[PDB]
Design a protein around this ligand. Structure first.
Ligand SMILES: CCN1C[C@@H]2C[C@H]3c4onc(C)c4[C@@H](O)[C@]2(C1)N3C
Ligand SMILES: CCN1C[C@@H]2C[C@H]3c4onc(C)c4[C@@H](O)[C@]2(C1)N3C
Length: 130
């Protein structure tokens, strides 16, 4: 219905605003673009599903997310990819792990404080009806 298309349009506006706010924080600059396969040819042999904040904005615009749950699965993949690729005790590794955990906690805290529980339940019921 037209009312259902208006629901999904409101969801995309909300997700773009969350994602752009994460993308301007100086801590998260390393997550804003894909890993350059030149500089890091090894990356794509270890990490099977690369993900970054530029890719997330492209996916919103292609209508790939019908719920906040499916968006948070991509935020979780940005974080898990950084933890898996950089697991060592050295400071470079420890700094990117700390930043990855901060990105995930920041996204969850914005959504907890700014999404109504009933808007997300409506998106999940339209999704399950398709
Ligand atoms: C050129 C200096 N490198 C330091 C970082 C460690 C590792 C990494 O893991 N996730 C991302 C994103 C990145 C890149 O920022 C990075 C580039 N590497 C491929
Ligand atoms: C319980 C009634 N809700 C009204 C508000 C609308 C929306 C929202 O957007 N930013 C913030 C902050 C808030 C919350 O205060 C709120 C709680 N919602 C999640």
């Amino acid at each position: 219905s037209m009312q259902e298309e208006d629901t999904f349009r409101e969801l995309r506006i909300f997700l773009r605003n969350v994602t752009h706010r994460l993308a301007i924080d100086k801590r998260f600059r390393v997550f804003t673009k894909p890993v350059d396969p030149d500089e890091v040819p090894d990356y794509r042999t270890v990490i099977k599903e690369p993900m970054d904040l530029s890719s997330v904005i492209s996916k919103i615009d292609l209508h790939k997310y019908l719920t906040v749950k499916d968006y948070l699965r991509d935020i979780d993949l940005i974080c898990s990819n950084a933890l898996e690729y950089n697991p060592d005790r050295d400071p470079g590794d420890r700094l990117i792990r700390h930043r990855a955990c901060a990105l995930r906690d920041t996204a969850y805290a914005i959504i907890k404080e700014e999404l109504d529980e009933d808007f997300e339940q409506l998106c999940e019921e339209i999704q399950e009806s398709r």
